[PDB]
Amino acid sequence: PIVMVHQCISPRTLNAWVKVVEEKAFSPEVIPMFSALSCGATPQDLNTMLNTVGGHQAAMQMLKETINEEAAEWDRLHPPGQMREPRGSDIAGTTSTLQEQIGWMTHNPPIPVGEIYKRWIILGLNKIVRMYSPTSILDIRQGPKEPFRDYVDRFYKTLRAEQASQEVKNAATETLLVQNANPDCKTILKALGPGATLEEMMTACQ
Amino acid sequence: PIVMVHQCISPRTLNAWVKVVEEKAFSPEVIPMFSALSCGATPQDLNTMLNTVGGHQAAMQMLKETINEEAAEWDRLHPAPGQMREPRGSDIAGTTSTLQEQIGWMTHNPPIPVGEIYKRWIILGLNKIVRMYSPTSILDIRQGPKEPFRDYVDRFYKTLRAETLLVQNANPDCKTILKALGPGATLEEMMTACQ
Amino acid sequence: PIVMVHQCISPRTLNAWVKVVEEKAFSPEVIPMFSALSCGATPQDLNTMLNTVGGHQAAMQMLKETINEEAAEWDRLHPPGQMREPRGSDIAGTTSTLQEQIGWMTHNPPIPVGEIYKRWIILGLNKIVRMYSPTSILDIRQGPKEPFRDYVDRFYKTLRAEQASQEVKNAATETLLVQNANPDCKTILKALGPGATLEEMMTACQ
Amino acid sequence: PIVMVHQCISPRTLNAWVKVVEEKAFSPEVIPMFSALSCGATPQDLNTMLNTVGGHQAAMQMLKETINEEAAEWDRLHPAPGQMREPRGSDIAGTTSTLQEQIGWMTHNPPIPVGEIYKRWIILGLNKIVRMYSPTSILDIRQGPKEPFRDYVDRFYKTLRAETLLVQNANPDCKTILKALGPGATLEEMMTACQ
Amino acid sequence: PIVMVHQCISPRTLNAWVKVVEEKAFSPEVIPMFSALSCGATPQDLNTMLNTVGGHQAAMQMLKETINEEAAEWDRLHPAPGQMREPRGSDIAGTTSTLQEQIGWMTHNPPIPVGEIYKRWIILGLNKIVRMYSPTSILDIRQGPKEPFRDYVDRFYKTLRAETLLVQNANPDCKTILKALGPGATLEEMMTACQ
Amino acid sequence: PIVMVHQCISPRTLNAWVKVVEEKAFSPEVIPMFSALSCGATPQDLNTMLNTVGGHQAAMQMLKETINEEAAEWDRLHPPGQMREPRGSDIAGTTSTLQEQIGWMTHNPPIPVGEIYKRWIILGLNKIVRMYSPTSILDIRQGPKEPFRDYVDRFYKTLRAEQASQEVKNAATETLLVQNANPDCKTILKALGPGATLEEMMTACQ
Ligand SMILES: CC(C)(C#Cc1ccc(-c2ccc(Cl)c3c(NS(C)(=O)=O)nn(CC(F)(F)F)c23)c([C@H](Cc2cc(F)cc(F)c2)NC(=O)Cn2nc(C(F)(F)F)c3c2C(F)(F)[C@@H]2C[C@H]32)n1)S(C)(=O)=O
Ligand SMILES: CC(C)(C#Cc1ccc(-c2ccc(Cl)c3c(NS(C)(=O)=O)nn(CC(F)(F)F)c23)c([C@H](Cc2cc(F)cc(F)c2)NC(=O)Cn2nc(C(F)(F)F)c3c2C(F)(F)[C@@H]2C[C@H]32)n1)S(C)(=O)=O
Ligand SMILES: CC(C)(C#Cc1ccc(-c2ccc(Cl)c3c(NS(C)(=O)=O)nn(CC(F)(F)F)c23)c([C@H](Cc2cc(F)cc(F)c2)NC(=O)Cn2nc(C(F)(F)F)c3c2C(F)(F)[C@@H]2C[C@H]32)n1)S(C)(=O)=O
Numbered sequence A, C, F: 001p002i003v004m005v006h007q008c009i010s011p012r013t014l015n016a017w018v019k020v021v022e023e024k025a026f027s028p029e030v031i032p033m034f035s036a037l038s039c040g041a042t043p044q045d046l047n048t049m050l051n052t053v054g055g056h057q058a059a060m061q062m063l064k065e066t067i068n069e070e071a072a073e074w075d076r077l078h079p080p081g082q083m084r085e086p087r088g089s090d091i092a093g094t095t096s097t098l099q100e101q102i103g104w105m106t107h108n109p110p111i112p113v114g115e116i117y118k119r120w121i122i123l124g125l126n127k128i129v130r131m132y133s134p135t136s137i138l139d140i141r142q143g144p145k146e147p148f149r150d151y152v153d154r155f156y157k158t159l160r161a162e163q164a165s166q167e168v169k170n171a172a173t174e175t176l177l178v179q180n181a182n183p184d185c186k187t188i189l190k191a192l193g194p195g196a197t198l199e200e201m202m203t204a205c206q
Numbered sequence B, D, E: 001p002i003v004m005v006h007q008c009i010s011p012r013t014l015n016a017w018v019k020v021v022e023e024k025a026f027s028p029e030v031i032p033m034f035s036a037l038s039c040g041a042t043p044q045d046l047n048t049m050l051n052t053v054g055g056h057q058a059a060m061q062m063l064k065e066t067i068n069e070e071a072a073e074w075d076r077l078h079p080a081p082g083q084m085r086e087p088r089g090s091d092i093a094g095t096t097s098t099l100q101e102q103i104g105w106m107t108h109n110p111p112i113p114v115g116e117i118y119k120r121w122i123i124l125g126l127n128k129i130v131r132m133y134s135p136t137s138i139l140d141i142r143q144g145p146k147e148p149f150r151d152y153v154d155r156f157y158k159t160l161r162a163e164t165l166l167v168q169n170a171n172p173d174c175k176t177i178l179k180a181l182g183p184g185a186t187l188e189e190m191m192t193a194c195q
């Protein structure tokens, strides 16, 4: 990473990333973990992290195709001894050296190729998280003997993995959460009506 | 975090927070653990920690609604090129502010401590979650007839933690001993007397 | 902690304290562990450590009442832009900010509120260690088939948890150790008489 | 390593490399792990890491023979008191050079990066080892009749990693779905279609 | 410890010492572990490490009595506002000295190294404990008739560690081989001969 | 160690050495582990590391006799307020203080007593690795149903533990490897003839 001087990847940062994917796969928390463990990363560090992912090579190829899509858009938007202009392949670290990546990231002003690449990767990880969610939000309904908290847990766990704006996800919640509570809770919830906080809803259905 | 220069979140700090929620859920010790592990945190760091919470998404939405309540109050109380702008509640929560803006606010002279402000909102929300997930009222904590007094007091204050009654809820044999001490006994004296 | 500048609690120091209490409860070694892990701690750090204690809330309330006792004694002894005088509640961190605690601890000369509070806590932990010792020293007697070393181990393990001066504890040893050895060892021990070292006693009864 | 001053190898860096070979042998992720854990390494550090590999001594001799091939090519391309001498291939590999000579080359103005050069030779050898120890050809990766498409693609690119065909090797039901998409489908579209 | 400025004891240094006593008790390797983990330690640090020893309180009282013996000898050999006072044995052991006094002695020009002095007393006591807890005399270590020579030598020097005889205590078949070598054989020659 | 100022042994370096010997004993990888974990070590650090070795006291006495041999050779070759000349016992740290060892190692120019001692120890460890190898190279022969890679693994594992020059070990390989392959592979190997790489041999016998 760049901390401005270049620094070696630490073994613990690398191991922390491998362990996250091993234990959580592509649960939504992989994205905050990747962003935090990739703080300051060069494109070379980013490629190291992705290359250490064990298995899940279908998702990694999907990630690659997302990167190629974003690099093509970068090239569309941005066609001796001096700083080169980075193309998409440079940002992805396929056609650029570490020395060039350091030069871009530490220049005044910088071309933050590490942050640009990280954005493309996170977009790819968002797609993977959506693709690998085992549930769809229309199928989350409160069981007749499921505590309301357990149902809300399942609801937002599913909604968390979908790829959409926060405002879009909130519309889905207003459309489905109370409506798919079980009969006894749904009537209590509708009696409270809109504007009830989730805290108030959970107290009323406990 | 900011320690003023910005530093990356530490991998151990990150893992420590995930592990605490994994192992203890929302027992009351999650609050001091969060406060200690979020020392110096930016709003981006704070959203990172909260986003790494596995499961418990009902609690996390409740936390989100507490943050929005506090952000709305911030906006009620606090409604140029190259100059520093005034943070809204959404800026403090990190939904409409960049990391550079957060660093700028947090390191300014004088600082707008958006990380500390957001952390206060989060801890208020965590307090609500700890209360919500406590399974028992203090009224229902009563010493069993064969329960050692120390175990009963352990359950009592563990329950109070998440929220004269100690004497009233003791079992008949110990209540008689405790009443004979007279009011004003220390807990150590009560525990010695009913040992 | 203060190391003079303030520094964040480290996750490992915090975890080390939680693990000590988890594994040892209120064995006497909790006190050296707490003192070492709380080196440089502010009252806020000290409250963080105590608040992370899992369970044992009876002891924690007893600790609280010891702190309130000491703070009341501090207040009895010690009734723009300048340094405030700390009351007992300030030292315990209930009515003081971290900024004020840093100010006291780094002042020239300092009001060492962290060390003062730590003293009150350790006094409280000493009480808890005494209260939670499962044995009393009068009940430690060498079995007819217990090796002398095992008996001495049990004797000093019990004496270690009692709350008393070192000179008082040494008086109890002179009163009880040889006297409560089993018949065969007690005669050998008395034959050596006083002034024998524990090394010499253990050789003579092995 | 050199970070320019020479530093001792870290015990965690050392253990991390031993553990990776212990747990994953020569799966393809050994290459990025070696490259990351050998950041800044001298040839002495690199020989230390390789000498700590437990077992797999056939692979290690193959690595040795790759290094000698590259060293011979270096000598083909690049054949005074107190002055700095020109490194041979054996000097870059650390068989005939001292640590002080390696430090001198690596820190000179301009530097002869013997650590980076040796690391390139080693990674070329590790690439050969990864290929040799892959048990399967991509031609033999075909979707089972009850195999979910995602599991098949997982095996496919895991196999390719160590080395239109994806469509041809899919099972009849999915191949029909994939052909109906027309050429040019993204992998995400193929995976959605055969989900 | 002092590294000169005073530093807090490290949590890992602390845990490393507790773990060593937990796992190996008072096998001889406890001595080098204590010496290494007490590098730079003040008398307060040294009392902290010793106070964290779990169990083994008979050994710890023996250690205490050794310290008092050495402290009495110190007082036999070495019997003003703002000035530095002369440390007694109790000051070196940390029973009558403050941390600031210990820091003052240890960092003075020239220093009174009370931490190193106390550490020598402690190691003398630990040596006594290692001897006391060794269960066997070297006279009772003899090679079994089916015991490989290497295992016997392992037991032999492990026993000597805690405290011609090697030849005399070997079994008849190996003793004959060793006598035929003649005196002056290295241990490697003896081990090769009786392999 | 010396990093030029003296520094305490780190607990993790020490634990890493103890764990290596615990898990690997005197497999050949003990030597690179010892050399890396002893980087910068004083003779006192080196004695600390060797003294923490659990068990294996026969090898440790053999190591001691190797050190005494090398120290005797050093003494043969190298018979107020100024720097003392180190004898072999000084280099081994038996008759020298840490202060003297620091003085030698940090002098201008240095007497690198830490590196000298480390050389003697590694020579001793080489002997121990050879002595404790459970196989001899003449006994490594490819089974009739052993994959060629498994046989080569066993061959070089055995050869790795022998104490000899690399050129000597390579002569043993040319003398024995193909010659002790099983009949079917040996004929394929001889058909390729000399100059075949091990990669080519392993492909031809797979
Ligand atoms: C080891 C080291 C020295 C290095 C490097 C290194 C250098 C560059 C690149 C790279 C980066 C971005 C793109 Cl977009 C492409 C590209 N896009 S392209 C031109 O259209 O094919 N190609 N490349 C290879 C390049 F540059 F060589 F051309 C890349 C990689 C990627 C990093 C990566 C890993 C990952 F998991 C997911 C990603 F999105 C990106 N790793 C690979 O690609 C390895 N891989 N191999 C194959 C296959 F076998 F099928 F072919 C497959 C992968 C895969 F990606 F995992 C995915 C399953 C398919 N690593 S290091 C620094 O890590 O120590
Ligand atoms: C990954 C990364 C790059 C980032 C970021 C990032 C950026 C901003 C915000 C955020 C912060 C504060 C508020 Cl108040 C809102 C808000 N309030 S609002 C406008 O009224 O909806 N919205 N946001 C999203 C924003 F900004 F996009 F709008 C936020 C988040 C939160 C952080 C957070 C996590 C948490 F657990 C509890 C919290 F209180 C806050 N995370 C999410 O919200 C994710 N999430 N998604 C849903 C879903 F919609 F599915 F139901 C749900 C959550 C949930 F919160 F967990 C809860 C279960 C419901 N993260 S990073 C820095 O972590 O690396
Ligand atoms: C989370 C965070 C932000 C903070 C803080 C924070 C701030 C202040 C204080 C505090 C400190 C000292 C005293 Cl004397 C009192 C006091 N004495 S009093 C006026 O006479 O009641 N009160 N306080 C609360 C105050 F200040 F709010 F008033 C305190 C605490 C204590 C710290 C503490 C924990 C502990 F284990 C043992 C201690 F001796 C002290 N924690 C609590 O008290 C929590 N607790 N709650 C209850 C109960 F539910 F029964 F009520 C019970 C406890 C308990 F102590 F554990 C014990 C079982 C009984 N923590 S942080 C920095 O940790 O991240």
Ligand SMILES: CC(C)(C#Cc1ccc(-c2ccc(Cl)c3c(NS(C)(=O)=O)nn(CC(F)(F)F)c23)c([C@H](Cc2cc(F)cc(F)c2)NC(=O)Cn2nc(C(F)(F)F)c3c2C(F)(F)[C@@H]2C[C@H]32)n1)S(C)(=O)=O
Residues within 6 Å of the ligand: D044, D045, D047, D048, D049, D050, D051, D053, D057, D058, D060, D061, D063, D064, D065, D067, D068, D093, D094, D095, F031, F032, F033, F035, F036, F156, F159, F160, F161, F166, F169, F170
């Ligand atoms: C311990 C320490 C102080 C050191 C050093 C040290 C110094 C130099 C070298 C070395 C480096 C490069 C080449 Cl190309 C040759 C070479 N090529 S050659 C002239 O044509 O034979 N020889 N050397 C030995 C040299 F220099 F002595 F000549 C080397 C090694 C290698 C490092 C290495 C390990 C590895 F796994 C794979 C590698 F590619 C390189 N280690 C060995 O070779 C050990 N080894 N032994 C044999 C045996 F002979 F038994 F079959 C075998 C190996 C083996 F390689 F593992 C492989 C299975 C065969 N280590 S340290 C710094 O680690 O602390």
Ligand SMILES: CC(C)(C#Cc1ccc(-c2ccc(Cl)c3c(NS(C)(=O)=O)nn(CC(F)(F)F)c23)c([C@H](Cc2cc(F)cc(F)c2)NC(=O)Cn2nc(C(F)(F)F)c3c2C(F)(F)[C@@H]2C[C@H]32)n1)S(C)(=O)=O
Residues within 6 Å of the ligand: C031, C032, C033, C035, C036, C156, C159, C160, C161, C166, C169, C170, E044, E045, E047, E048, E049, E050, E051, E053, E057, E058, E060, E061, E063, E064, E065, E067, E068, E093, E094, E095
């Ligand atoms: C907690 C903390 C704040 C502190 C401190 C603190 C301060 C001073 C001392 C101390 C040091 C040296 C000597 Cl010579 C004597 C002494 N010699 S004497 C006058 O002749 O009695 N006395 N002391 C106590 C003093 F100073 F108070 F007087 C000491 C101790 C010792 C440290 C120690 C532990 C150990 F294991 C072995 C040692 F050799 C020394 N610990 C104790 O003695 C505790 N202990 N208690 C008893 C009991 F009485 F129950 F039998 C027993 C012990 C025991 F030693 F373990 C042994 C089994 C017997 N610790 S901290 C810095 O650790 O955070």
Ligand SMILES: CC(C)(C#Cc1ccc(-c2ccc(Cl)c3c(NS(C)(=O)=O)nn(CC(F)(F)F)c23)c([C@H](Cc2cc(F)cc(F)c2)NC(=O)Cn2nc(C(F)(F)F)c3c2C(F)(F)[C@@H]2C[C@H]32)n1)S(C)(=O)=O
Residues within 6 Å of the ligand: E031, E032, E033, E035, E036, E157, E158, E160, E161, E162, F044, F045, F047, F048, F049, F050, F051, F053, F057, F058, F060, F061, F063, F064, F065, F067, F068, F092, F093, F094
């Ligand atoms: C604890 C501490 C403060 C210290 C120190 C300390 C100081 C010096 C020395 C030492 C160093 C080198 C030589 Cl050559 C001799 C020597 N050679 S000699 C004159 O011809 O006998 N003697 N010494 C002891 C000296 F100096 F005291 F004389 C040494 C040792 C050795 C270090 C060592 C350990 C090891 F494993 C292997 C080694 F090659 C060297 N440790 C011992 O020798 C302990 N030991 N004891 C016996 C026995 F019981 F049989 F006797 C046996 C050993 C043994 F070596 F393990 C081997 C099984 C036989 N340690 S510390 C810094 O570690 O914290």
